[PDB]
Amino acid sequence: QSVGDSIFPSLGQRGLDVQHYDLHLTVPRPGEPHLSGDVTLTVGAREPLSRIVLDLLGPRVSAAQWNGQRVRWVQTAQKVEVTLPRPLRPGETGRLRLIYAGTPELSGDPLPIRPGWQNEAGLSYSLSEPHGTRGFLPCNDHPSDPATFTVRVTVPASASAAASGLFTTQTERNGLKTLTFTQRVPVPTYALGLIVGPLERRTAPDVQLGTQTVHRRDIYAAGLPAGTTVPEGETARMLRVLSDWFGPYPDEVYGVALLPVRQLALETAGLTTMPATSNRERVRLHALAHQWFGDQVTLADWADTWLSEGFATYAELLWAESQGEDGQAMAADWYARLSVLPSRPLRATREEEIFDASAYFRGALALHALRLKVGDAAFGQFLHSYVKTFTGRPVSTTALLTLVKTQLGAEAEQTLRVWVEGRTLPPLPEPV
């Protein structure tokens, strides 16, 4: 069956655990949606599976293999079903290879954006939150199932490409270039960054977070507006302040891909996809904070988006305080702007809620209430334990409350409960 998401009940396959995607993507003309793909999924399972059912929306599979053998497959309107010769059982892993080509389709909900493979002004790129990656990649398209990625992108020699993960090698043959990237920490499918077109890679000095080293590089697309810049040394300072709050930076590199398109930013892994119209300090910090909350700590259900958006938004207040600003004052402007609009319990119930004003600011103010309740020292240690508790394990609002009660006490749990439940907006959290 499907994963059973409360918001998108048809996505994914229950019990499937994709561990790695080995993707060879070819884009013949950047800016045009057509492409071809060759992917090998290394998959495990949490329950016996007699079939592998992946989300795919657009392209047409031409061949399928399981452990190097011919395999039975069929492609429905939104899925590819692969009948295995014997069931995949917990503890086992197999290699599913799918050959496909065609045109990715954007998923609907007119959601702030139609997610999927984007094409505009000589650029083709992924902006796939929540469920757009299935457009160009046969995948278990649900954040409950993060995975590692190895991406081989083949584009004309006149163009270039950039995907999440460390840049390894580039080869050229018959007017085509192939670039290889290795995303070596598991992230959700929508966090797979992929951009092809006129792109320039720009390295920066390595950042050192204690004993961890974080490589630095940004992507600069052509035709950026005036003032589309990343200030020198800013990313290093953000990494320092954030990792001191949340724990080690989960990836090996970080930067932004500045695109001359008009869209909202997306926290694609280790390489934030950043349209110029969203390039702001708070957004650059927000997207970086998501590398912990969203990419490393992933959602068990799309209803709990406030665990990603509320946490990343509160990191903007943490960064503001680090830079000498009044955090309580910032929380007051959040409350004032929420006062005017409707509120809801933090568990979303329908599609239009998962990215509304309460996912961001009521979720952030929920953490403010907890922080003022327990103290900055206890709050900081909690965020560290929260990241570690939910690394390699999808997070839920219910599981968060349990961890708060376990670590911070039942009283703190009750304080968070006030903000997690109830339709009306509680009073502005203030220091007692």
Interacting residues toward ligand ARG by CB under 6 A: 112, 129, 264-267, 286-287, 290, 355
267 binds Na ion (CB under 5 A): no
| Residues numbered 371-390 forming contacts with Na ion, rule: CB under 5 A | none
- By beta-carbon proximity to ligand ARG, the closer residue of 274 and 416 is 274
Element (H, E) at 219: strand 212-221
Task: List the x/- string, 252-291, binding to Zn ion by CB under 5 A.
Answer: ----------------------------------------
141 binds Na ion (CB under 5 A): no
d(CA 80, CA 19): 18
- By beta-carbon proximity to ligand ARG, the closer residue of 112 and 375 is 112
- By beta-carbon proximity to Zn ion, the closer residue of 145 and 309 is 309
Side-chain-facing half-sphere of 223: CA atoms under 13 Å: 11
- By beta-carbon proximity to Zn ion, the closer residue of 312 and 331 is 312
- Interface segment toward Na ion; rule CB under 5 A; list 13-21, 84-92, 287-295, 346-354: 13-21
- By beta-carbon proximity to ligand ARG, the closer residue of 352 and 411 is 352
β-sheet bridge partners, residue 97: 40, 65
- Interface segment toward Na ion; rule CB under 5 A; list 140-148, 204-212, 377-385, 413-421: 140-148
Residue 92, amino acid: E
DSSP code, position 346: S
> How does strand 16-26 pair with strand 147-156?
parallel
CB of 114 to ligand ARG, least distance (A): 11
DSSP code, position 227: T
Phi-psi category of residue 67: left, alpha or beta, with phi > 0 → left and psi -120 to 50 → alpha: left
Binding-site partner at residue 145 among ligand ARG, Na ion, Zn ion, none, CB < 5 to 8 Å by type: Na ion
Choose which of 5, 129, 141, 309 interacts with Zn ion (CB under 5 A).
Answer: 309
> How does strand 272-275 pair with strand 256-259?
parallel
CB 185 within 8 A of CB 19: no
CB 405 within 8 A of CB 411: no
Tokens of 401: 């409350």
3-state secondary structure of 299: strand
CB 241 within 8 A of CB 319: yes
41 binds Na ion (CB under 5 A): no
295 binds Zn ion (CB under 5 A): no
- By beta-carbon proximity to ligand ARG, the closer residue of 71 and 127 is 127
d(CA 16, CA 165): 24
353 binds Na ion (CB under 5 A): no
- Interface segment toward Na ion; rule CB under 5 A; list 76-84, 144-152, 207-215, 340-348: 144-152
304 binds Zn ion (CB under 5 A): no
- By beta-carbon proximity to ligand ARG, the closer residue of 204 and 357 is 357
DSSP code, position 148: E
Closest CA to 401 of 387, 382, 414, 383: 414
Q: What is the binding site for Na ion (CB under 5 A)? A: 17-18, 145, 147
Q: What is the binding site for Zn ion (CB under 5 A)? A: 309, 312
